[PDB]
Design a protein around this nucleic acid. Structure first.
Ligand SMILES: Nc1ncnc2c1ncn2[C@H]1C[C@H](O)[C@@H](COP(=O)(O)OP(=O)(O)OP(=O)(O)O)O1
Ligand SMILES: *[C@@H]1c2c(cc3ccc4cccc5ccc2c3c45)[C@@H](O)[C@H](O)[C@@H]1O
Ligand SMILES: [Ca+2]
Ligand SMILES: [Ca+2]
Ligand SMILES: [Ca+2]
Ligand SMILES: [Mg+2]
Length: 341
DNA sequence: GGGGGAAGGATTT
DNA sequence: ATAAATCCTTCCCCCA
């Protein structure tokens, strides 16, 4: 199999640069203003200019403005970035019917029936980079390898504006030298658990007793890494079918007053049904971020579809189930629909 | 013992 | 101190 993976460079920030090229070159910071007080919220992402000084996705907008007080701060415009993404994702389809849109700025292409070797594939990668740069003025990074995992790892090594190929040869090398924490699907918690087991490279999973590995990181993960270590991993590229859709919103101020939260909750539901579009959910979940940032959710499933009206009533029931089973004040509140028909 | 499915916390991104 | 989704593990009914 030959898989070409595409990841848009500092997407949100870049899109802003595209709609305002004067920004090009200066440090740009896209933020999510939570409005609980002037400049509350976080940095969704920043371009490399700003990234260069520690301003990056995740940090508080306040911290940011301290390091780069004179950087361009813009509010996140998801809808806009969503539409650009959509235009680019379509250009990608021109190159393969077998495409797997993984995220708003990531796509997997199975180009097995398009090229014969990595040289051809590499070229196709450049063709694609030029197409997107031309059509949308957006730079991306291309990762190419035998499976999705390595195609992604490739992109990771090459971004920004790069392109890399990991041949069957280097794959083998990487299975022995790559820091296992850098493997897709392995976050801090798993990486940590692995370190404790003397497993720092993929290959290490082959020399450890399975059941001991399973008991630590779980059967799914254990199998996943082992298949990678055995150079046997090779899941097919598949159309992504959104299994759940929801919206979560931060409140002006903490609270556990059902009447003070409802607005946020309903708002979340509305934004959700709009996103649902045609999709009818049978399950619903309410999620709340408590004041100490712990997360609590309560849901319910129905034997039939759910009308928006139902969602409203039912979501309030769940909100209360939360409010009564947890004494902490709520900070952020959301709803999540799933099990579509 | 385990299929099957529901629920809630865990983990990744 | 943003936000969106999927992934494990647990509990529970019950097997014709
Ligand atoms: N709190 C956080 N801590 C660390 N990383 C974060 C945090 N919040 C978000 N991020 C990550 C997810 C962001 O939406 C992602 C953003 O941007 P982009 O401009 O595409 O990046 P990129 O190409 O370097 O990486 P990527 O595509 O993986 O997101 O950075
Ligand atoms: C959102 C959130 C938080 C922490 C992290 C940490 C590392 C991340 C790496 C890549 C992507 C990413 C996306 C969202 C994150 C990330 C990361 C928390 O601080 C916060 O409470 C949210 O869960
Ligand atoms: Ca990207
Ligand atoms: Ca990692
Ligand atoms: Ca908890
Ligand atoms: Mg990405």
């Amino acid at each position: 199999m030959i898989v070409l993976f595409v990841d848009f460079d500092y997407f949100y920030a870049q899109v802003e640069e595209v709609l305002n090229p004067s920004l090009k070159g200066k440090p740009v910071v896209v933020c999510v203003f939570s409005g609980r007080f002037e400049d509350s919220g976080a940095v969704a992402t920043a371009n490399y200019e700003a990234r260069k000084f520690g301003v990056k996705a995740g940090i508080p907008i306040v911290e940011a403005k301290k390091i780069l007080p004179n950087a361009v701060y813009l509010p996140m415009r998801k809808e806009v970035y969503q539409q650009v993404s959509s235009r680019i994702m379509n250009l990608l389809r021109e190159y393969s019917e077998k495409i797997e849109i993984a995220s708003i700025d990531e796509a997997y292409l199975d180009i097995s029936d398009k090229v014969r070797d990595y040289r051809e594939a590499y070229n196709l990668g450049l063709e694609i980079k030029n197409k997107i740069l031309e059509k949308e003025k957006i730079t991306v990074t291309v990762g190419i390898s035998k499976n999705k995992v390595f195609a992604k790892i490739a992109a990771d090594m090459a971004k920004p504006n790069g392109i890399k190929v990991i041949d069957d040869e280097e794959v083998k090398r990487l299975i022995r030298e790559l820091d296992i924490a850098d493997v897709p699907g392995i976050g801090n918690i798993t990486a940590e658990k692995l370190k404790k087991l003397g497993i720092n490279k993929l290959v290490d999973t082959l020399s450890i007793e399975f059941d001991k590995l399973k008991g630590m990181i779980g059967e799914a993960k254990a199998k996943y890494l082992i298949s990678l270590a055995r150079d046997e991993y090779n899941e097919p590229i598949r159309t992504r079918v959104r299994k759940s859709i929801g919206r979560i919103v931060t409140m002006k101020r903490n609270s556990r007053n059902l009447e003070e939260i409802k607005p946020y909750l309903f708002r979340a539901i509305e934004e959700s049904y709009y996103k649902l579009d045609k999709r009818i959910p049978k399950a619903i979940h309410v999620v709340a971020v408590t004041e100490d940032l712990d997360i609590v959710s309560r849901g319910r499933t129905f034997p039939h579809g759910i009308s928006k009206e139902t969602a409203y009533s039912e979501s309030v029931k769940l909100l209360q189930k939360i409010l009564e089973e947890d004494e902490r004040k709520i900070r952020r509140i959301g709803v999540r629909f799933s099990k579509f028909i």
